[PDB]
Every structure is written in C-alpha cells, then in structure tokens.
Amino acid sequence: NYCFAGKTSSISDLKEVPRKNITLIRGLVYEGQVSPLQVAVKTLPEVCSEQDELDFLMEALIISKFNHQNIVRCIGVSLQSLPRFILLELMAGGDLKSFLRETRPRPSQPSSLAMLDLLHVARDIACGCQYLEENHFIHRDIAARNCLLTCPGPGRVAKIGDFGMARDIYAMLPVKWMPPEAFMEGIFTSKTDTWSFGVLLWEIFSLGYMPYPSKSNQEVLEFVTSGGRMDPPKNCPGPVYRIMTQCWQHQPEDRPNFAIILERIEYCTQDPDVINTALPIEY
Numbered sequence: 001n002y003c004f005a006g007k008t009s010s011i012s013d014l015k016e017v018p019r020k021n022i023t024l025i026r027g028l029v030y031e032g033q034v035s036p037l038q039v040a041v042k043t044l045p046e047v048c049s050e051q052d053e054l055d056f057l058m059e060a061l062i063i064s065k066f067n068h069q070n071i072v073r074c075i076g077v078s079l080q081s082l083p084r085f086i087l088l089e090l091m092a093g094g095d096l097k098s099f100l101r102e103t104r105p106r107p108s109q110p111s112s113l114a115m116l117d118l119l120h121v122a123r124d125i126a127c128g129c130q131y132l133e134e135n136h137f138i139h140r141d142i143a144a145r146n147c148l149l150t151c152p153g154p155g156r157v158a159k160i161g162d163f164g165m166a167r168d169i170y171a172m173l174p175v176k177w178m179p180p181e182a183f184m185e186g187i188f189t190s191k192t193d194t195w196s197f198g199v200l201l202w203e204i205f206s207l208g209y210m211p212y213p214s215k216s217n218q219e220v221l222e223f224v225t226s227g228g229r230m231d232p233p234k235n236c237p238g239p240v241y242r243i244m245t246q247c248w249q250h251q252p253e254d255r256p257n258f259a260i261i262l263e264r265i266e267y268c269t270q271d272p273d274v275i276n277t278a279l280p281i282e283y
C-alpha cells in the first residue's frame, strides 16, 4: 500500500528490529542504540487513534524507500512492540533552523559560520531535492525546520528529515513556503518544491530567520499572489539572491529544475566574491 518510484511496498517490507536489541539513551525522539549502532528513535504514543497508527506506518514506509546521501536513512522499525518505534539515522547536529539560530556569528564566536558553510548546506539539500524530483516525489514542505545536520562542526552534512506533509497528502499549512498555484488551485508539481527551496535558501542565508518578517500567513498569501517577493537577507551576495528570485518565478514552468539550481549553487561556491563575503555578526 505505498508506491514510490513505481514500486510498491507494505508493512511487511519494513526491516523489523527485535525490541530486545533496542536501548533508549536520552531524549533529543530519543537517542538509542541497536545491537553498537547509534540511532534516533521516533516513538508513537500508545494513546493514539488508528489514524495516528496509519500515519506512523506510512511515515515508516515513505522514509524506508528513499536511498540517498541527503535523505535521513531508516535503520528499521520496531512495530510489534509498544510503544512502536521507527529507527532513524542519528543526526547529532539537530534541525537546520535551530542550528542556524544557535550557530550564527556572535562576538563569542565571530567566525562560527562562513558563506561557504551555508552554500554547502544549500547544495546538500538541493541534491536531496534533485533525487526526489528525479523520482517524481513531491515533498510539499521543503523548509529549514524539516532538515537535519549530521553534526554541529565542520564536515556537517544537511539532509531532508521530515516527510509529514507528503505523508498526510498520501492554520497549520506551511503557507510561507508555498507557491501561488498551491494556494489558489491546490495544485502541486515538482515546481512547487522549487519555490519552497527558494524560501529555504532565504532561511539559510538569513541565518535562520522566519520568512516574510512581520507578515502573518494571510498577509504573505496576498503579498505573494500579488507579485511580492522577500528582499535579500543581510549581506546576501547578489548571485545567491538571484537563485532565490528565479525559484520564485510566478509561472511554474519558468522556475529552474534542481539540476539547474545545483549548477548555480556550485557556481556561487567557486566565485571568490561570493564566498569571501562576511556574514553579519549578531550582537
């Protein structure tokens, strides 16, 4: 009962891990060990509806079918014991939005991030999105809060880690990440992830600000459907802002695909005038 890349899978295909092999270590979702493999353990509340149950199963099926370095791996599940577990790659850096906020330059850490760090995050997630696009999977909620980092320090890799919106489709709408045609007609295509990536790019280069500062969801909806776009984040290089504004083309067919976005990110990455730009320091 779940189809991805033209292949079907069901609960039977999930890799069940004996509960006795699984130890919880600490809350982070928990850090856990499988018998020694470090994992994150996502739990289903025992007090939940059968729809929560089906939601949890679908989440497991979706993440287990992906195979890509910028999408969080599923080690397995433990569904035959209660509470039910999904076992996931442990991402010690935590979520991207929190990371940017915590790790932005300050006097105590004046060079905590550089432009190249942000470009590598952008590349990482764009590579994940390209894999989803080429496999015809529409994510529908590409946003910093949904991405995870392998570790806090140098060599960190960013990955897409949450697929709940796609799971649900398979006041809570992520309006600020959605293109005009998703509001109006409720039409989604891979061009809709392109728009959302544009907004994630603004999040990254703003070092974790909420998009459309000062605007509520409905004000954003009217702004965007009237042609309004966000200004550049502070100190954002022109070439990077231009990737964003191309992602935010009104017509879906005018937005770049992720192969092109990756090309432009790689280009920014080799340009000394981009990567030698200092990030703002937060006081």
Ligand SMILES: CN1CCN(c2ccc(C(=O)Nc3n[nH]c4c3C=[N+](C(=O)[C@H](O)c3ccccc3)C4)cc2)CC1
Pocket (backbone or CB within 6 Å): 028, 029, 040, 042, 072, 088, 089, 090, 091, 092, 093, 094, 095, 096, 102, 145, 146, 147, 148, 152, 161, 162
């Ligand atoms: C100073 N710091 C830095 C370190 N820190 C953390 C905070 C959170 C985490 C964390 O949740 N790591 C995760 N690893 N794998 C998964 C995780 C969440 N998953 C999920 O499935 C979650 O549902 C999810 C998915 C995407 C984005 C966020 C949450 C799968 C790790 C370190 C605490 C504060």
